[PDB]
């Protein structure tokens, strides 16, 4: 039907407030929930309904700063929340040593991203510490882990690393040559990109791989025209009405962004069917509580609400800012980031 | 030991064995964002978990505490890491931990932390004897679980267990020929064993796929596999393929078949073939057939492909 803009604004507001205990499993990634909400409000041009200053302090309290003796550099970045019990400190005093306190790549990413959206200038971010932490996360095969203590490694984190380096406008955070190698090796026989070599290609990892290369400004250099044509074919074949993540799987609203954004980066999103995509996304809209779900008549969540809105944005929905397809923020925010990078270079 | 829902469950703040520890609370500061409300029970377990973590206490009581923390939130990677630290420090029976993680994964097969934990255990034990059967059970509840397939490929490659996988793949393709995960597995097995350079293997595979396509012509997975194993060798280098496909067009048609033909004609044009201008028209004719009636949703895309072929071969 129609886009219930105000309802979605309220939905995101509620996400930033208080959640029922049934959402406890999101504790360690509250920062990315904040991202979905903040970036979602930005996308709807409603960042005025929140107190940017309070939220900025909260985010800074999540930064893992180097200790006096700077012996924990390999563990700096941002935490997903305060679940460790470390005393509230909005990046004021130095770091309070803790045996298991370290950053998480997806949190360092969403954290920096949130700060930029809120208008902060990142002056309180220990850029060198974050980059040191990032470097420590890269494996021999070029991919990344989420935390220094060890975790699964895949394309998702390669994208996070790329975004971090891009936002801090410094690529010393990774061995780009090895990352590119990992991305190439993930290409499947069916031409999509998988989480890793040999795995089933997926809409999500294809976005992560392609967006990473675009952020590095090496798409053309890494893939030949023939290769890019094969990838484009794989991606555009994902549309059924809305988009699915892999062949023979049901469509899901969030792919309208994952795959749609990939198509945009490959310059052929314009050749997709807008109406069927838009109609599907809206059919998953929760007209009562707001937000979007993965499927129609399904429960809405911050992730699908945000990506459904970004999916709509790709087709320039009336009332939604244009999303920067590779950075995953509003073009307005990406622009503000350009200014920031400029001001630093002086 | 003491279950979280047992009638006789006692908060850690009321347990004698924990009297010496000062619980550590979480603090989100003056204005909390995305704050989750916790029940007394939940906050109590984690207030003590924080205490134990902060002091890096490698005790048996801490080990039992992680069991509760995990029951409350299996997505807390820090808890799993600490539990692994304890598994080592206390030299716990890893075979028992395998039973534990096996149950946890069955209840939460989509959790990243639980699959990572199991992988670390198998690496520690250097024992993959239970893996293939465990994964087959999970794949039995959800044949497309990405975590399961990823773990399966890791186990097979790490301990070289290729012997029966191709047979497993054949079994699953009979259960659901449309499972894209299984077709991916098939290519994974073959390219890591015999490879496809053996003409006898290539022929077996191409023939196998055509048989599957004949059974269910509208299956992107089968068509992607077929194109996948031939595209790099050069589609135009297989004359009998082109004709065999043109013979299916009558009945077993589908947008996947039409698309394949277009790709064959394109490969030909790419290799300065004979009747360049005539081949190009055969292609363009198909692109338009796709756009106007066979794959209309991609109408603008096929037209775009057509225009690309013209401006490149004329």
């Amino acid at each position: 039907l129609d886009f219930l803009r105000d309802r979605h604004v309220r939905f995101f507001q509620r996400c930033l407030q208080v959640l029922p205990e049934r959402y406890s499993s999101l504790e360690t990634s509250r920062l990315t929930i904040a991202f979905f909400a903040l970036s979602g409000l930005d996308m709807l041009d409603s960042l005025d309904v929140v107190n940017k200053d309070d939220i900025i302090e909260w985010i800074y309290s999540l930064q893992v700063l180097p200790t006096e003796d700077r012996s924990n550099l390999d563990r700096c970045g941002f935490r997903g929340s305060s679940y460790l019990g470390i005393p509230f400190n909005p990046s004021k005093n130095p770091g309070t040593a803790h045996p298991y306190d370290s950053g998480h790549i997806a949190m360092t990413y969403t954290g920096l991203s949130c700060l930029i959206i809120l208008g902060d200038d990142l002056s309180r971010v220990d850029k060198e510490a974050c980059l040191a932490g990032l470097r420590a996360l890269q494996l021999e095969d070029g991919s990344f882990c989420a935390v220094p203590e060890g975790s699964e490694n895949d394309m998702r984190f390669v994208y996070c690393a790329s975004c971090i380096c891009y936002m801090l406008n410094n690529w010393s955070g990774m061995d780009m040559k090895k990352a590119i190698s990992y991305i190439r090796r993930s290409m499947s026989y069916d031409n999509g990109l998988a989480q890793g070599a040999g795995l089933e290609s997926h809409g999500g990892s294809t976005f992560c791989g392609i967006a990473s290369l675009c952020l590095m400004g090496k798409l053309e250099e890494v893939f030949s025209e023939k290769e890019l044509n094969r990838i484009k074919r794989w991606c555009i074949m994902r549309q059924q009405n809305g988009y699915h993540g892999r062949p023979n799987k049901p469509v899901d609203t969030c792919y309208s962004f994952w795959v749609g954004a990939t198509l945009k980066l490959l310059k052929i999103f314009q050749y997709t069917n807008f109406e069927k995509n838009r109609n599907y996304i809206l059919s998953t809209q929760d007209r009562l509580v707001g937000g979007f779900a993965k499927w129609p008549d399904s429960h809405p969540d911050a992730l699908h609400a945000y990506f459904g809105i970004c999916g709509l944005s790709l087709m320039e929905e009336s009332g939604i800012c244009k999303v920067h397809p590779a950075l995953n923020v509003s073009t307005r925010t990406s622009e503000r980031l350009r200014d920031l990078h400029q001001s630093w270079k002086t | 030991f003491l279950s979280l829902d047992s009638p006789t469950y006692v908060l850690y703040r009321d347990r004698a064995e924990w009297a010496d520890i000062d619980p550590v609370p979480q603090n989100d500061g003056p204005s909390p964002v995305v704050q989750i409300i916790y029940s007394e029970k939940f906050r109590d377990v984690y207030d003590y978990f924080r205490a134990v973590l902060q002091r890096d206490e490698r005790s048996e009581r801490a080990f039992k505490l992680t069991r509760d923390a995990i029951e409350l939130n299996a997505a807390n990677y820090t808890v799993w890491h600490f539990r692994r630290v304890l598994l080592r420090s206390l030299q716990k029976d890893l075979q028992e931990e395998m039973n534990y993680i096996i149950a946890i994964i069955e209840e939460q097969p989509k959790n990243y932390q639980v699959w990572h934990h199991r992988r670390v255990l198998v690496e520690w034990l250097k024992d993959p004897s239970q893996e293939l059967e465990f994964i087959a059970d999970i794949l039995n509840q959800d044949a497309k679980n990405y975590h399961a397939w990823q773990h399966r490929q890791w186990v097979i490659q790490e301990f070289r267990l290729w012997d029966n996988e191709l047979q497993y793949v054949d079994q699953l393709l009979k259960e659901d020929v449309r499972n894209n995960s299984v077709w991916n597995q098939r290519h994974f097995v073959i390219s890591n064993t015999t490879g496809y350079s053996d003409r006898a293997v290539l022929e077996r595979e191409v023939q196998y796929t055509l048989e599957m396509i004949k059974l269910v012509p509208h299956n992107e997975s089968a068509w992607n596999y077929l194109k996948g194993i031939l595209q790099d060798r050069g589609l135009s280098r297989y004359p009998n393929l082109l004709n065999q496909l043109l013979d299916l067009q009558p009945s077993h048609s589908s947008p996947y078949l039409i698309a394949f033909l277009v790709d064959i004609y394109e490969d030909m044009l790419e290799n300065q073939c004979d009747n360049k201008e005539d081949i190009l028209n055969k292609a363009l004719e198909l692109c338009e057939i796709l756009a106007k009636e066979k794959d209309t949703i991609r109408k603008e895309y096929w037209r775009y492909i057509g225009r690309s072929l013209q401006s490149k071969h004329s």
């Binding site: 999101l26 990634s29 997806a106 998702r156 999500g204 992730l303 | 989509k110 990243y112």
Partner: peptide, 4 residues
């Protein structure tokens, strides 16, 4: 959480 589906993605983390």
């Amino acid at each position: 959480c589906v993605i983390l």
